[PDB]
Ligand binder design. Sequence first.
Ligand SMILES: NC(=[NH2+])NCCC[C@H](N)C(=O)O
Ligand SMILES: NC(=[NH2+])NCCC[C@H](N)C(=O)O
Ligand SMILES: [Zn+2]
Ligand SMILES: [Zn+2]
Ligand SMILES: [Zn+2]
Ligand SMILES: [Zn+2]
Ligand SMILES: [Zn+2]
Ligand SMILES: [Zn+2]
Lengths: 228, 224
Amino acid sequence: ASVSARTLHFGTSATYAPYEFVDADNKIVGFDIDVANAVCKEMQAECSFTNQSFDSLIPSLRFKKFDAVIAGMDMTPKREQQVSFSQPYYEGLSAVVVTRKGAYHTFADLKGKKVGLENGTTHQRYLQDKQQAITPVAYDSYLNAFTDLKNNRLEGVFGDVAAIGKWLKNNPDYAIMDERASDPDYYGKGLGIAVRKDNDALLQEINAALDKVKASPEYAQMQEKWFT
Amino acid sequence: ARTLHFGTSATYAPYEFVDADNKIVGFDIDVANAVCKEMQAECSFTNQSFDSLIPSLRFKKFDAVIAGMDMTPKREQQVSFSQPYYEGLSAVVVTRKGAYHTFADLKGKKVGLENGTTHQRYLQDKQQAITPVAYDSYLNAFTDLKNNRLEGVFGDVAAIGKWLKNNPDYAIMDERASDPDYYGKGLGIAVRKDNDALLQEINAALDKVKASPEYAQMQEKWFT
Ligand SMILES: NC(=[NH2+])NCCC[C@H](N)C(=O)O
Ligand SMILES: NC(=[NH2+])NCCC[C@H](N)C(=O)O
Ligand SMILES: [Zn+2]
Ligand SMILES: [Zn+2]
Ligand SMILES: [Zn+2]
Ligand SMILES: [Zn+2]
Ligand SMILES: [Zn+2]
Ligand SMILES: [Zn+2]
């Protein structure tokens, strides 16, 4: 007596092209969206997305506001204490600073300067722990961070290379800084889909679906589309 | 520190084949090597006919098998498979260009394939008016086709497509087979049923490999 296909409710933060972002007609799109839709199709489910701040996603997941989270989210040990992750669906990569082109080369060069980043991220934890001479400025959206960079309120913005690279396409006055951050205490954990801790049946359905999606020519094409 | 011994059948470009330097190469070779790297293991290959791989795996001749092998129900009774590492796709016949259009047109004719394959079982069960000619090796089947001893060779679209690139007198037949009862299961790495510790390591390795940009590049190398 069901009157619709099962619907899997995903939480995300659509501030982060090419992983997830909002297009011209206010629709959520990106690599993660294509992945989640493909997973839902394998599960014979419809997909629903809720867009909210990145730092609120794990808490809302735990509060049962949605079934799963996909948001370019590294499977860190800290997050693994709070949620259950799927198998990695994509690799965790190196973090970069974007600054005015030629203005900074290294983290040392940023001594005493303001660098914007997102609340709740690997990037925030890395800068706070390992680059204490730099002032981290927390935002609930990389979009506000970029605005503040362009208005000279910040000297840099620190995030995933794909996201920064994407932003740079429309901002040639800026450049990825030479020194990158790769510390494996912070970086290199794969991207995962998160579910609540006591939700193994759903998690294993998601894993079984990812096994299939990741073996598909379409999944190679998703990477080609979003990461080239 | 460790070696993983794979059994394969290097008769099936681009999955696995012998190149002009007498070395075994291909998509499956790259995948198995990547799996071995994640497991911090050396990679070793044994080359033998496709229909002997599973009996040999059970006999403990090697640890695993990778050979563009579909994960069929009949095989799962005999061995354990990893998660899929590539999709099982459509099967096609190659013939002299324009000579045949449908399986119906091949009535009472000889069509080559490897023994023990999905393609064999589909022909025998679904195209009984066609004579199956079972080979140990696709290489020999192709040779017979060029020598007019067969009317067609029946196999996976990538392998047939790859052979075609150097044989322009031939063509993929109009009617293709993708019957879900024989095709579409997905390719697996096979291990022995009582070797679940090894199976779990390979699955954990594949989880990482399949999440990698390198694995997308592998497909772009071998399938485009
Ligand atoms: N949708 C987003 N805003 N994602 C931000 C992710 C940043 C980084 N990859 C992390 O795991 O913390
Ligand atoms: N290495 C080979 N000769 N592989 C043949 C595979 C043919 C077919 N995909 C099967 O599973 O039966
Ligand atoms: Zn729900
Ligand atoms: Zn749109
Ligand atoms: Zn917040
Ligand atoms: Zn798994
Ligand atoms: Zn061995
Ligand atoms: Zn034989």
